[PDB]
Amino acid sequence: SAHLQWMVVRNCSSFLIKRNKQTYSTEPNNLKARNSFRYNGLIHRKTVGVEPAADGKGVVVVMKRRSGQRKPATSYVRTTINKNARATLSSIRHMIRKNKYHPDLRMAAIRRASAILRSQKPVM
Amino acid sequence: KGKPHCSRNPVLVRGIGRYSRSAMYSRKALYKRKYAALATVTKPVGGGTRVVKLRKMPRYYPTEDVPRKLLSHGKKPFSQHVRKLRASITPGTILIILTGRHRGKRVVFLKQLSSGLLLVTGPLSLNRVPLRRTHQKFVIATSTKIDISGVKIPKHLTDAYFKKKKKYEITEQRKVDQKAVDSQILPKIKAVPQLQGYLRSVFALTNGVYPHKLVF
Amino acid sequence: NFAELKIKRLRKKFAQKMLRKARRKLIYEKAKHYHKEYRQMYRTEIRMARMARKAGNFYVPAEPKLAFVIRIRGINGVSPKVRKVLQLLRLRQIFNGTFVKLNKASINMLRIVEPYIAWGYPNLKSVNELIYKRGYGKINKKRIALTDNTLIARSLGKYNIICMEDLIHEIYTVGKHFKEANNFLWPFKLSSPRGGMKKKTTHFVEGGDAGNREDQINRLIRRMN
Amino acid sequence: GVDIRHNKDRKVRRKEPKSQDIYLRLLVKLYRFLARRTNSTFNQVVLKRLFMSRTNRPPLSLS
Amino acid sequence: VLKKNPLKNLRIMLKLNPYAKTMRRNTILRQARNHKLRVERAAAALAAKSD
Amino acid sequence: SGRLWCKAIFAGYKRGLRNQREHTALLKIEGVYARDETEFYLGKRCAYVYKAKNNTVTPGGKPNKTRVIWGKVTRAHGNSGMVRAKFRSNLPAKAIGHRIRVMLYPSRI
Amino acid sequence: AALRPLVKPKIVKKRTKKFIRHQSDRYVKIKRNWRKPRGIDNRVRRRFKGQILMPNIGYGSNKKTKHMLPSGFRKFLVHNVKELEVLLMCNKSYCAEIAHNVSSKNRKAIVERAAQLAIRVTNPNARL
RNA sequence: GAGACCCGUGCGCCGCGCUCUCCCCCCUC
RNA sequence: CCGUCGGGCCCGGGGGGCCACGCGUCCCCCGCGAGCGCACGGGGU
RNA sequence: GCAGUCGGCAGAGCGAGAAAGAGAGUGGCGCGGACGCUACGCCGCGACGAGUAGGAGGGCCGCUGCGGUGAGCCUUGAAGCCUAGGGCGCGGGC
Ligand SMILES: [Mg+2]
Ligand SMILES: [Mg+2]
Ligand SMILES: [Mg+2]
Ligand SMILES: [Mg+2]
Ligand SMILES: [Mg+2]
Ligand SMILES: [Mg+2]
Ligand SMILES: [Mg+2]
Structure with missing residues (x-):
């Protein structure tokens, strides 16, 4: 299970960075990029990811599906959101809270949507 | 419906009233006083009529946020602090300014302001010190005094008046207020002999003259 | 529903508030007594x-x-009988203070440790300000300051010692549960005595510090506390 | 200066299993929660026995 | 919790000891009473010198 | 127009015989030769004014060579009117025996 | 203009001078890096007054400001553009530092990426 | 604090006692 | 018999402080009032 | 101490001197709510801190080489070396 996979990968993953008295996980759906049990994006049955869209505008959100856990081709469902910032945060908050879909990742995903949207707004 | 009343016991010392619990119960007469038992504005459009929400969502969240602090209780802002004045400072006393560009000069204290700063003028016809604020910890309070009981200080000479604004020129109002206070306080100065020259002089330390020995 | 559950929990809060004011009036009238x-x-x-x-x-x-x-002496060069009696008296630092109830067995121990202690018979005021300023409990083997009455009453309340004034009364009028009310107290960690010392290495009656300064320990307590 | 001996301040009792077995460590993670958040002393004895070495956990025969 | 001195903090003293409010209301009322009796007697002496 | 500070001498650091504590300075104020006379100056502000080579900015002025270590009086030292003072930076030992201005304006009177 | 931390506490350091090895001024063969003196007669080990101070754990920094830069961040070595986005969420307290062997055509890319991500760079104008 | 009949710091624990849900009188602007 | 700012909630009969202030019955004895603030109040604003 | 992040499947309690249940039944508008939790983690209280010979622990201290890994770095400049530059760490060192 997830705790077992965590007890395997907690110190021996390839996404592990241990530099400068810090620890980061370079995993694709790790919100906050933190090596943790909670924020790990591989070991759970239900994961949320947030990253920039394929084109430079928008935020794509990733939800892990329930059935094909051992089937990585159909496992993650990606949804591109190109709205204004308040609507994009409303969409992510409704996807996480109204579905009850892994609900402790709500504002990690909201803050990641905000960070990607700020990074997409250009500097003067 | 009740018009408020003052507290029915006086202050004995700070924190303790004069009368005890049952005495204050009688003085409040509680023995005959037994008792028993926002977000949405609806606005038209041109559609129909919408429920517009105020207090809308934050468009941006910072990546990290500071936690809210614990609560404290005795910590009041500067506009609510208590104002202590030294008991050697009374209206009409002579002060010695110690710090600013008018240092050593002797001035006539009038009134303490609402920020605790000392409104003062040793008159511009004597000192070149205008209506001005000073600070009590930075003035020396000598025990020579003028009775200024009959002196009308204008009500608008406040800390908002004396606050620095933002190339400085005296306004016409500040010109006429110094005259309106000088024309009153100056006949009280000149009715006691040599005090006008005393205020014209400045305070200085010389050889053998020590401040712990000199009484002012 | 929940309208009766809400008043059920508010009744519990009201009952506990009335219990607190009853205990408050009890502490008031007992200190009055x-x-x-x-x-x-x-x-x-x-x-x-x-x-x-x-x-x-x-x-x-x-x-x-x-x-x-x-x-009043240090932890250097102590003969082992004197050192043993001092740790039985819970005085393991210089300028640590303890209350001792007096009998023949205790007085003969103080007689062993005469060059190392200074003692005497404390006033009501000395007991009061010692408990109020340097009073620390020994709760769950930790040194907790006596900031609440419940902090004493959870440990000594079964001996009917429920506030600071029962604690002071039990120490002063040496009561039935003096051992528990004095072992609950941490040994007082007093400052250096203010105004200096007369002579630390000789007895009090030969113009020094050590020994039984009989009612003159209160003058020392004002300067140490 | 305090006259206390510091030879036996540190207790020499096991805080965790020395084994890096992840299955035993997940069992210890379960029974840390149980031995802390229950009133049962059985869970405490189980957790301290999960800590021990193989020699301090000798096998139990059927008979 | 920061330890406050009940010998210097009045309402820490009242939190530990509710009767200290009564004991400090008395021997302030009593002390003012004794001081005005003292000055009434000091005035009576200098008045009796004027007889 | 005239002098507004008391004259004091940096007599040394707070010290025993073989241990000097540089963070506390011993002032000798001119006119103070008893501990009863020290009560005026306790809490007053004291300044070690000195000149160096490069210019530094002067508050309410144009840059010149004078530089100040600010401080204040904390307590008396001994029966003979010597005083303990604490400065923002510890005073340089080149200033021992030299002048410290004792200002008049933490006024209490 | 610059990127600020989330909070800026005053970074109180109990010592600022480095702990010099004993007798490293008298010799070039003795490097300044610290060694505990272990000789029997050694004044520094015996802690005599007026000597070179030995490092203690009491000298250790506050845990709220340990490893904190004087700007108020904590640095993280970055070797490429991909290792910036681990600091995309730690940006208000942890800053980026491009490694010393990253070429001048990739330093430009890491700097222009961190400007988008609002990550502070300790050395933005390094090679150029 | 409201509470499944409502969704509000985003100044509250303990402990002290202030006023109002009663009615009059005196004094000062 | 005398004495005690004695002890009896200062036993009992003919100006000043009290963490005393519903009523009804039986006998003994001579559980949810409401609001408003102020603060020596769970570590600086 | 904390798996209780128990949320329109909601109701946000468990510091409080006194063994135990904020137990359950039946008769008499507006869609909101910081952080956390590498559980080998994080947090809270209290006491303490000398050290030769000696013992033990932790080293995101360091060197070399191997097995995995970093869609790592590198001729738009690696190792090495020098540096009155900027710093971090109690320190080894980086
Ligand atoms: Mg000795
Ligand atoms: Mg002294
Ligand atoms: Mg020690
Ligand atoms: Mg030891
Ligand atoms: Mg041992
Ligand atoms: Mg030797
Ligand atoms: Mg040691």
Whole structure:
């Protein structure tokens, strides 16, 4: 299970960075990029990811599906959101809270949507 | 419906009233006083009529946020602090300014302001010190005094008046207020002999003259 | 529903508020009573001297039952009998203070540790300000400051010692549960004494510091506390 | 200066299993929660026995 | 919790000891009473010198 | 127009015989030769004014060579009117024996 | 203009001078890096007054400001553009530092990426 | 604090006692 | 018999402080009032 | 101490001197709510801190080489070396 996979990968993953008295996980759906049990994006049955869209505008959100856990081709469902910032945060908050879909990742995903949207707004 | 009343016991010392619990119960007469038992504005459009929400969502969240602090209780802002004045400072006393560009000069204290700063003028016809604020910890309070009981200080000479604004020129109002206070306080100065020259002089330390020995 | 559950929990809060005010009134009236106890003992001792002085006899006061002991030497060069009695007295630093109830067994221990302690018979005021300023409990083997009455009453409340004033009364009038009320107290960690010392290495009656300074420990307590 | 001996301040009792077995460590993670958040002393004895070495956990025969 | 001195903090003293409010209301009322009796007697002496 | 500070001398650091504590300075104020006379100056502000080579900015002025270590009086030192003072930076030992201005304006009177 | 931390506490350091090895001024063969003196007669080990101070754990920094830069961040070595986005969420307290062997055509890319991500760079104008 | 009949710091624990849900009178602007 | 700012919630009969202030019955004895603030009040604003 | 992040499947309690249940039944508008938790983690209280010979622990201290890994770095400049530059760490060192 997830705790077992965590007890395997907690110190021996390839996404592990241990530099400068810090620890980061370079995993694709790790919100906050933190090596943790909670924020790990591989070991759970239900994961949320947030990253920039394929084109430079928008935020794509990733939800892990329930059935094909051992089937990585159909496992993650990606949804591109190109709205204004308040609507994009409303969409992510409704996807996480109204579905009850892994609900402790709500504002990690909201803050990641905000960070990607700020990074997409250009500097003067 | 009740018009408020003052507290029915006086202050004995700070924190303790004069009368005890049952005495204050009688003085409040509680023995005959037994008792028993926002977000949405609806606005038209041109559609129909919408429920517009105020207090809308934050468009941006910072990546990290500071936690809210614990609560404290005795910590009041500067506009609510208590104002202590030294008991050697009374209206009409002579002060010695110690710090600013008018240092050593002797001035006539009038009134303490609402920020605790000392409104003062040793008159511009004597000192070149205008209506001005000073600070009590930075003035020396000598025990020579003028009775200024009959002196009308204008009500608008406040800390908002004396606050620095933002190339400085005296306004016409500040010109006429110094005259309106000088024309009153100056006949009280000149009715006691040599005090006008005393205020014209400045305070200085010389050889053998020590401040712990000199009484002012 | 929840309208009856809400008033059910508010009834519990109201009942606990009434229990707290009942305990508050109990602490008030019992400290009121202890004030009268101290004044009856003080005026009874004075009156007992006076009726003997009228008759021409002598009234000998009762030998004191409470001593406050202050360790005045260091932890260097202590002979092991003296060191053992000092750790049995819970005085393991210089200028640590403990209350000791006095009997033959305790006085003979203080007699062993005379060059290392200075002691005497504490006043009501000395007991009061020692508990109020340097009073620390020993709760769950930790040194907790006596900031609440419940902080004493959870440990000594089964001996009917429920506030600071029962604690002071139990120490002062050396009561039935003195051992528990004094072992609950951490040994007082007092400052260096303010105004200097006379002579630390000699006895008090030979013009020094050590020994039984009988009622003169209170002057020392004002300077150490 | 305090006259206390510091030879036996540190207790020499096991806080965790020395084994890096992840299955035993997940069992210890379960019974840390149980031995802390229950009133049962059985869970405490189980957790301290999960800590021990193989020699301090000798096998139990059927008979 | 920061330890406050009940010998210097009045309402820490009242939190530990509710009767200290009564004991400090008395021997302030009593002390003012004794001081005005003292000055009434000091005035009576200098008045009796004027007889 | 005239002098507004008391004259004091940096007599040394707070010290025993073989241990000097540089963070506390011993002032000798001119006119103070008893501990009873020290009560005026306790809490007053004291300044070690000195000149160096490069210019530094002067508050309410144009840059010149004078530089100040600010401080204040904390307590008296001994029976003979010597005083303990604490400065923002510890005073340089080149200033021992030299002048410290004792200002008049933490006024209490 | 610059990127600020989330909070800026005053970074109190109990010592600022480095702990010099004993007798490293008298010799070039003795490097300044610290060694505990272990000789029997050694004054520094015996802690005599007026000597070179030995490092203690009491000298250790506050845990709220340990490893904190004087700007108020904590640095993280970055070797490429991909290792910036681990600091995309730690940006208000942890800053980026491009490694010393990253070429001048990739330093430009890491700097222009961190400007988008609002990550502070300790050395933005390094090679150029 | 409201509470499944409502969704409000985003100044509250303990402990002290202030006023109002009663009615009059005196004094000062 | 005398004495005690004695002890009895200062036993009992003919100006000043009290963490005393519903009523009804039986006998003994001579559980949810409401609001408003102020603060020596769970570590600086 | 904390798996209780128990949320329109909601109701946000468990510091409080006194063994135990904020137990359950039945008769008499507006869609909101910081952080956390590498559980080998994080947090809270209290006491303490000398050290030769000696013992033990932790080293995101360091060197070399191997097995995995970093869609790592590198001729738009690696190792090495020098540096009155900027710093971090109690320190080894980086
Ligand atoms: Mg000795
Ligand atoms: Mg002294
Ligand atoms: Mg020690
Ligand atoms: Mg040891
Ligand atoms: Mg041992
Ligand atoms: Mg030797
Ligand atoms: Mg050691």
